[PDB]
Design an enzyme around this catalytic site. Structure first.
Site, short mmCIF file in Angstrom:
data_model
loop_
_atom_site.label_atom_id
_atom_site.label_comp_id
_atom_site.label_asym_id
_atom_site.label_seq_id
_atom_site.Cartn_x
_atom_site.Cartn_y
_atom_site.Cartn_z
N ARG B 11 0.80 -1.21 0.00
CA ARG B 11 0.00 0.00 0.00
C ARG B 11 0.84 1.27 0.00
O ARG B 11 0.57 2.19 -0.78
CB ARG B 11 -0.96 0.01 1.20
CG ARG B 11 -2.05 -1.06 1.13
CD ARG B 11 -2.91 -0.90 -0.12
NE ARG B 11 -3.59 0.40 -0.15
CZ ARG B 11 -4.30 0.82 -1.18
NH1 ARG B 11 -4.44 0.05 -2.25
NH2 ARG B 11 -4.89 2.01 -1.15
N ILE B 12 1.85 1.34 0.86
CA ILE B 12 2.68 2.54 0.89
C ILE B 12 3.62 2.53 -0.29
O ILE B 12 4.06 3.59 -0.76
CB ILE B 12 3.47 2.64 2.18
CG1 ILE B 12 2.52 2.91 3.34
CG2 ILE B 12 4.47 3.78 2.09
CD1 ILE B 12 1.73 4.22 3.19
N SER B 152 5.76 6.93 11.84
CA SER B 152 4.48 6.31 11.50
C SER B 152 3.46 7.29 10.89
O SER B 152 3.67 8.51 10.89
CB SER B 152 3.88 5.65 12.74
OG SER B 152 3.99 6.51 13.86
N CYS B 153 2.37 6.74 10.36
CA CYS B 153 1.32 7.56 9.75
C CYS B 153 0.70 8.45 10.81
O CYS B 153 0.35 9.61 10.54
CB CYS B 153 0.24 6.69 9.07
SG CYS B 153 -0.46 5.29 10.05
N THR B 154 0.58 7.91 12.02
CA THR B 154 0.01 8.65 13.14
C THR B 154 0.95 9.77 13.61
O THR B 154 0.58 10.96 13.61
CB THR B 154 -0.29 7.71 14.32
OG1 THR B 154 -1.22 6.70 13.90
CG2 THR B 154 -0.88 8.50 15.50
N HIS B 180 -8.45 4.88 14.15
CA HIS B 180 -7.75 4.56 12.92
C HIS B 180 -8.41 3.56 11.96
O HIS B 180 -8.99 2.55 12.39
CB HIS B 180 -6.40 4.03 13.35
CG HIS B 180 -5.34 4.16 12.33
ND1 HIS B 180 -4.82 3.08 11.66
CD2 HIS B 180 -4.64 5.24 11.91
CE1 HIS B 180 -3.84 3.48 10.87
NE2 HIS B 180 -3.71 4.79 11.00
N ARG B 198 -5.77 -7.35 17.29
CA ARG B 198 -5.59 -7.23 15.86
C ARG B 198 -5.99 -8.53 15.18
O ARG B 198 -6.26 -8.54 13.98
CB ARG B 198 -4.13 -6.95 15.52
CG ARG B 198 -3.57 -5.67 16.07
CD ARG B 198 -2.31 -5.29 15.32
NE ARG B 198 -1.98 -3.89 15.53
CZ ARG B 198 -1.42 -3.10 14.61
NH1 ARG B 198 -1.13 -3.58 13.42
NH2 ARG B 198 -1.16 -1.82 14.88
N1 LIG Z 1 -0.89 0.65 5.91
C1 LIG Z 1 -0.68 1.91 6.33
O1 LIG Z 1 -1.61 2.69 6.54
C2 LIG Z 1 0.75 2.29 6.80
C3 LIG Z 1 1.83 1.40 6.81
N2 LIG Z 1 3.16 1.87 6.99
C4 LIG Z 1 4.31 0.94 7.03
O2 LIG Z 1 4.74 0.61 5.71
C5 LIG Z 1 5.11 -0.77 5.64
C6 LIG Z 1 4.19 -1.53 4.68
O3 LIG Z 1 2.86 -1.44 5.18
P1 LIG Z 1 1.64 -1.85 4.24
O4 LIG Z 1 1.95 -1.26 2.92
O5 LIG Z 1 0.40 -1.42 4.95
O6 LIG Z 1 1.69 -3.42 4.09
P2 LIG Z 1 1.38 -4.43 2.94
O7 LIG Z 1 1.25 -5.79 3.49
O8 LIG Z 1 0.28 -3.85 2.16
O9 LIG Z 1 2.72 -4.31 2.02
C7 LIG Z 1 3.94 -5.06 2.19
C8 LIG Z 1 4.12 -5.93 0.93
O10 LIG Z 1 5.42 -6.57 0.88
C9 LIG Z 1 5.25 -7.92 0.44
N3 LIG Z 1 6.38 -8.72 0.92
C10 LIG Z 1 6.57 -9.21 2.16
N4 LIG Z 1 7.79 -9.77 2.26
C11 LIG Z 1 8.31 -9.61 1.06
C12 LIG Z 1 9.56 -10.05 0.68
N5 LIG Z 1 10.35 -10.69 1.53
N6 LIG Z 1 9.93 -9.79 -0.59
C13 LIG Z 1 9.10 -9.13 -1.42
N7 LIG Z 1 7.87 -8.70 -1.06
C14 LIG Z 1 7.46 -8.95 0.20
C15 LIG Z 1 3.98 -8.28 1.09
O11 LIG Z 1 3.45 -9.49 0.56
P3 LIG Z 1 2.99 -10.61 1.64
O12 LIG Z 1 2.06 -9.95 2.78
O13 LIG Z 1 2.24 -11.67 0.95
O14 LIG Z 1 4.28 -11.25 2.39
C16 LIG Z 1 3.14 -7.07 0.79
O15 LIG Z 1 2.66 -7.23 -0.53
C17 LIG Z 1 5.06 -1.24 7.09
O16 LIG Z 1 6.29 -0.85 7.74
C18 LIG Z 1 4.00 -0.36 7.71
O17 LIG Z 1 4.15 -0.24 9.14
C19 LIG Z 1 3.42 3.23 7.20
C20 LIG Z 1 2.35 4.10 7.22
C21 LIG Z 1 1.04 3.64 7.02
#
Ligand SMILES: NC(=O)C1=CN([C@@H]2O[C@H](COP(=O)(O)OP(=O)(O)OC[C@H]3O[C@@H](n4cnc5c(N)ncnc54)[C@H](OP(=O)(O)O)[C@@H]3O)[C@@H](O)[C@H]2O)C=CC1
Ligand SMILES: NC(=O)C1=CN([C@@H]2O[C@H](COP(=O)(O)OP(=O)(O)OC[C@H]3O[C@@H](n4cnc5c(N)ncnc54)[C@H](OP(=O)(O)O)[C@@H]3O)[C@@H](O)[C@H]2O)C=CC1
Ligand SMILES: NC(=O)C1=CN([C@@H]2O[C@H](COP(=O)(O)OP(=O)(O)OC[C@H]3O[C@@H](n4cnc5c(N)ncnc54)[C@H](OP(=O)(O)O)[C@@H]3O)[C@@H](O)[C@H]2O)C=CC1
Ligand SMILES: NC(=O)C1=CN([C@@H]2O[C@H](COP(=O)(O)OP(=O)(O)OC[C@H]3O[C@@H](n4cnc5c(N)ncnc54)[C@H](OP(=O)(O)O)[C@@H]3O)[C@@H](O)[C@H]2O)C=CC1
Lengths: 346, 337, 337, 347
Positions: B11-12, B152-154, B180, B198
């Site tokens: 997502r990010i 963080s986003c927060t 949130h 969670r």
């Molecule tokens: N969601 C939000 O609102 C916020 C999130 N963040 C931070 O950003 C980060 C990502 O969050 P978010 O985007 O929500 O999470 P997601 O799960 O949407 O994104 C992470 C992605 O990485 C993939 N992935 C995991 N391991 C691997 C790997 N080893 N190699 C390649 N791809 C991989 C995951 O697939 P799979 O799950 O199948 O392993 C997933 O598609 C985290 O640190 C989060 O704390 C920061 C601000 C806001």
């Protein structure tokens, strides 16, 4: 009388355990669970469930691996590789494979190698050598010595089959299509993220999501006569549980009317399918079928024949509870007749 | 001028890439994308988003290991272990770590090994790592830092206007609670998790979970160390969240004076980061909002002259991304080696 | 014994009737139901509830102007103007006003005219009306009052444990924010409303709306007049809500001491009203909970020794109804002539 | 050129105004709205929309009854009784009746009595004397002098008709049933409360809700040949917008295959129905059809013929936007064919 293990303590597996607890006096006896999370994670979720609601009974954590439901202990182990399981040590007679991973002969059989006597898959088999049963339809076809690995079919197929039978068996099904507005499920993404099926990868909670389903074809597995005549899709809609099927088969018989088609169900409902089928005339909605012991319920007022030959039916079924209840009947049977890739979206 | 690599096209990851495409003359330049998903997966989801809506641009699957965006070509690789990624081979100057796993010295580092020069962690850093919140202390940055977290986003929301408060009324102490939207982290259906909260339904409950943003504030506003702390509530919404701060200041103050201060800063120093809004709106009305925080003026209220409560909205996905980009936007400037 | 009439067979109307059916030897006795809906409507919805689930009892449509519940017969009438209802003809001793319109002297009164003796308003009273919150001041009641309000779903939660705080640590001042499930009042889709916030989506947003429970506390806890005040957030959930209180007390205190106090009262005086829960749960886990308020112990936290924050869950529908019944349960006792 | 009034500033009516604004150069010209809420309630909701998102343009409140969209004023009145409306005073040429109440001859016509020239109902007529049109299908059938009250049919019917035509007109439709997984709507209860239809009275947001629908029969109104051959139900599911139809008609023709049925659409799509029909081969989901200008979109990969004769199709349509867009085309028509040339329930 018979020792049972539950491999996979999630929804269906937990729905199982619950189903089994408050029961007449099942010959079954759950003595072990395999939830990769310990007694904590496995207890909590058995006690507090967002879809079934707080479980009514003292559930305490004894030992570091042995919770108890009203005194009766339940040993709990955890390991992704069935081979390491203490099935033999404990002397497990039946294993409810509810993970959705071990669904082929080689796989599900790993339980036998560990020391299991018989294995029941809570889903369709990926092999071909494994028998697919659907209580109400062809349960008799199961007898000891005949394969030690069976599949209780699909949630959908177990809702269709029953009333699909009564249709063909008393009206003759030429052939037809079908759809199923289905409550989203664990295999779907919570928010748009990577997933082998770009449909399931979309926010399960905010989309009507079209996704293939064999549940249609598999009907044959229990009702040969239909082999290759049914078929259809499925639509995921923001509803955590309880789904409906929309069958449209143009009949072979005369050109009967609506309310009589119904009567067949109604007849076969309080008769041979007393406990499986049922017809509800009172206009309700999904939420009213939560915890429904019937494998299928037809919405009377919804049935409607179009051109004399084309019949259309709509059935209600709780995908979690219902199926789990049958899975306890199918395990109840076993006992009454007893002497890319690998992963892919986790 | 600065070659970038997006690791964790989640997502990010995507909210960022797109956040970027919209910027004019961006010192940043995406060239490679690493995610467990194939070129198909990267394309589709960059084009069709259930929250940002279909992406306005031509996105095709050009290549076996790449995708095209309005012509600009980008490579898509996939190694669950960073060390392998050809960061060195492609001369990766910066890596946007948005996977959620590599949040520590050890982890984020594997990027450095792969040949990458810097690693911007799209989340709070675990352990000893430079944490910067654009608008709250980006001047603390120095090209010397090889691994930084954009908080963080927060925190990125709560910080900006906390600075405004303390820097004007003096925050003595105060709690906060953030209602949130849910995130990939929650379970769609009661399933195992290390946070039995969670682990619950996510879409059927108000899930109290804990947040670091509480103490993380202090990370960037050294002055508030141990003065703030709160929890969070995960409610059934895919995006945009609100924070409910409650600080006790020294200098007795009143309702509109507070808001005023906010506006002043929002029009001067924090212009582009903080902002106020009087029009009585709701969640959805705050999608795609380039700012980090937005004060709901009409809600702000004071008690006994010193207890101030402030509600604040923020798009936990977009607004954050826009910050992430702004941070990386900075690394490109004030970059010597 | 005491003949009762339910006017406004809505959510609280039904949640009440059922709440009642479950009580043993109830001084109350429902005999007539008045709602804009026909006997069909009254039957169906009393039997099939989307939140409480199908009602365990035999509910048939016995009559052209009545329905049956386990045999007990009840008349169903329908006049949009109270004065007409045959309250006098049926000797209606008490009326449970749950319509949401007749909340004032003038309005509730029309019931008295119809021949009714008393009118319990299932909501806060507008103007000069006796407000009582079972557990917080029900002894203030006297058979003399002809019109009383059982306060709001929020106040009925926030009050009980506020009393506990003040009555032990002394509340100096404090705000609060209630993350609340939505209600019939909100618009299902952006449609006109006198509250352009409440007028929004409802199921797609966090809708900030205002609540009286803030000042209403004072109504029943005279001492806190003008010391409390907060807002509310309407999040996508059909039931069960949580309050986030934040008071500053005089007597310096710590985390577990507070919780302790709560438990003590919950085990003695407030037994049946307040209650604590350590098991980390979530919304849904609090349906059908006979108590008015439930403290989420593990969440309670203190700052600087005097700033206390307390989270508390409550079933805005059931728990309230159980209170409504308990109040009417009282009117039946201490009833002379 | 032509002055337009909008009676009913809700979803469809507001979706209208929006549709109309960002347009080529519609002969239409909204000059008045009838939202029982004033300029405030009427403005706010035009600017901030939970399903369409903040409206992109300066919307200010001039006068005490005259907001403005980028300078262009729009007078706003309010009264439940059309008779009291200043249609004549303002000289209203077309009225977009989007309330769902005035859907019969007597009713909708109250607008004419007020001084309106022509009235378009944004829903099916309850009468029988009112013509039902469906752009793409039988729009030609409309010509000035021919009734001053028309109905742009239903959201569903306007999604079905189009591709229902191509089916019969190039394969011959014997007869068939249909279902429609539909996004919940304003007529449904938010939480279980009294409502004339004990299904709609259930929490629109937490149930799959079965409710009758004429949208099926009404297809005939535009495609007579099918009269009394189609039919079906509808299912409300927790999704604020964008729905899908599940048509199952066993064909008359040979026993064609799947992907060719499609081709017909594809053909009639970029041809006679360029702007109405369309086929999307890429597997998406509801949310991907928000703001879709096509009155109907078929999910290629979903189509499937069973027994040679039985065909099954699935179409995607944004019930708010799409319909509203047709409603602006149907009001666009009226103007292009205009002289200068030749027990009351629910809530
Ligand atoms: N969601 C939000 O609102 C916020 C999130 N963040 C931070 O950003 C980060 C990502 O969050 P978010 O985007 O929500 O999470 P997601 O799960 O949407 O994104 C992470 C992605 O990485 C993939 N992935 C995991 N391991 C691997 C790997 N080893 N190699 C390649 N791809 C991989 C995951 O697939 P799979 O799950 O199948 O392993 C997933 O598609 C985290 O640190 C989060 O704390 C920061 C601000 C806001
Ligand atoms: N839900 C329903 O209505 C229906 C579901 N089914 C089918 O039954 C199966 C289970 O469904 P559902 O109950 O929803 O799923 P759940 O996610 O609730 O349960 C699956 C369980 O298996 C565990 N698990 C995963 N991998 C392993 C492994 N390798 N070894 C041991 N345990 C493992 C999971 O733990 P973890 O998540 O931590 O990996 C989880 O506890 C699926 O095939 C589903 O299609 C059939 C009919 C109906
Ligand atoms: N919902 C909740 O969580 C809580 C609500 N309350 C209070 O209880 C009251 C009811 O709330 P709620 O149950 O949620 O609302 P509902 O809308 O569910 O119920 C009110 C009912 O009264 C009916 N009604 C309206 N006017 C009349 C009339 N003139 N004569 C007879 N019947 C009539 C309504 O029908 P129709 O809509 O068709 O006019 C509706 O069926 C309100 O005071 C509310 O503040 C208290 C605690 C909690
Ligand atoms: N939403 C969609 O996707 C589709 C809807 N339709 C149909 O179009 C109609 C409108 O639908 P929708 O836009 O969802 O509804 P809305 O509730 O958005 O709009 C109806 C409007 O009419 C106003 N109104 C009610 N009564 C009167 C009256 N007596 N005099 C003047 N104005 C009045 C309402 O105000 P207030 O609520 O305050 O009374 C509201 O502003 C319905 O028939 C619907 O079935 C057709 C196709 C699609």
């Amino acid at each position: 009388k018979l020792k049972v293990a539950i491999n996979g303590f999630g929804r269906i597996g937990r729905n199982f355990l619950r189903c089994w607890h408050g029961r007449k006096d099942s010959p079954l006896d759950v003595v072990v669970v395999n939830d990769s999370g310990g007694v904590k994670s496995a207890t909590h979720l058995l006690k507090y469930d967002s879809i079934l609601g707080t479980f009514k009974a003292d559930v305490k954590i004894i030992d570091n691996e042995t919770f108890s439901i009203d005194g009766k202990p339940i040993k709990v182990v955890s390991n992704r590789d069935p081979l390491k399981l203490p099935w033999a040590e404990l002397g497990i007679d039946i294993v409810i494979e509810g993970t959705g991973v071990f669904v082929d002969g080689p796989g599900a059989g790993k339980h036998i190698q560990a020391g299991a006597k018989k294995v029941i898959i809570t889903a369709p088999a990926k092999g071909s050598d494994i028998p697919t049963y659907v209580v109400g339809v062809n349960e008799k076809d199961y007898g000891h010595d005949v394969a030690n690995i069976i599949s209780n079919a699909s949630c959908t197929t177990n809702c269709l089959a029953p009333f699909v039978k009564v249709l063909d068996e008393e009206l003759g099904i030429v052939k037809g299509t079908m759809t199923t507005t289905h409550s989203y499920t664990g295999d779907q993404r919570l928010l748009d993220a990577s997933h082998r099926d770009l449909r399931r990868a979309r926010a399960a909670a905010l989309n009507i999501v079209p996704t293939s389903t064999g549940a249609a074809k598999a009907v044959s597995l229990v009702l040969p006569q239909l082999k290759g005549k049914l078929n259809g899709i499925a639509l995921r809609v923001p509803t955590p549980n309880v789904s409906v099927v929309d069958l449209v088969v143009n009949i072979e018989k005369v050109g009967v009317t609506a309310e009589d088609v119904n009567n067949a169900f109604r007849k076969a409902a309080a008769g041979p399918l007393k406990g499986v089928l049922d017809v509800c005339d009172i206009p309700l909605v999904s939420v009213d079928f939560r915890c429904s012991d019937f494998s299928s319920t037809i919405d009377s007022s919804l049935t409607m024949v179009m051109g004399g030959d084309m019949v259309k039916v709509v059935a209600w079924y709780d995908n979690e509870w219902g199926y789990s209840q049958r899975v306890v009947d199918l395990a109840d049977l076993v006992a009454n007749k007893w002497p890319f890739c690998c992963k892919l979206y986790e | 001028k600065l070659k970038v690599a997006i690791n964790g096209f989640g997502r990010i990851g995507r909210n960022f890439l797109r956040c970027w495409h919209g910027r004019k003359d961006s010192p940043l330049d995406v060239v490679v994308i690493n995610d467990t998903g194939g070129v198909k997966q990267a394309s589709h989801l960059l084009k069709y988003d259930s929250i940002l809506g279909t992406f306005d641009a031509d996105v095709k699957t050009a290549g076996d290991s790449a995708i095209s965006v309005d012509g600009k070509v980008i490579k898509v690789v996939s190694d669950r272990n960073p060390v392998n990624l050809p960061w060195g081979d492609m001369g990766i100057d910066l890596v946007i770590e948005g996977t959620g796993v590599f949040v520590d010295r050890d982890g984020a580092g594997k990027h450095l090994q792969a040949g990458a020069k810097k690693v911007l962690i799209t989340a709070p850093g675990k352990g000893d790592i430079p944490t910067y919140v654009v608008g709250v202390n980006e001047e603390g940055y120095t090209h010397a830092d090889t691994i930084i977290s954009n908080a963080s986003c927060t925190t990125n929301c709560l910080a900006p206007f906390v600075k405004v408060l303390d820097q004007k009324f003096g925050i003595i102490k105060g709690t906060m609670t953030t209602t949130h939207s849910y995130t990939g982290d929650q379970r769609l259906l009661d399933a195992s998790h290390r946070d039995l909260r969670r682990a619950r339904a996510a879409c059927l409950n108000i899930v109290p979970t804990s947040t670091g943003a509480a103490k993380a504030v202090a990370l960037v506003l050294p002055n508030l160390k141990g003065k703030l702390n709160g929890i969070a509530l995960r409610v059934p919404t895919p995006n945009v969240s609100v924070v409910d701060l409650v600080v006790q200041v020294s200098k007795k103050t009143f309702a509109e004076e507070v808001n005023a201060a906010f506006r002043e800063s929002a029009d001067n120093e924090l212009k582009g980061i903080l902002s106020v809004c009087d029009e009585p709106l709701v969640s959805i009305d705050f999608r795609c909002t380039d700012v980090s925080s937005t004060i709901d003026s009409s809600l702000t209220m004071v008690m006994g002259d010193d207890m101030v409560k402030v509600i604040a909205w923020y798009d936990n996905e977009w607004g954050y991304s826009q910050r992430v980009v702004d941070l990386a936007d900075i690394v490109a400037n004030k970059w010597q080696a």
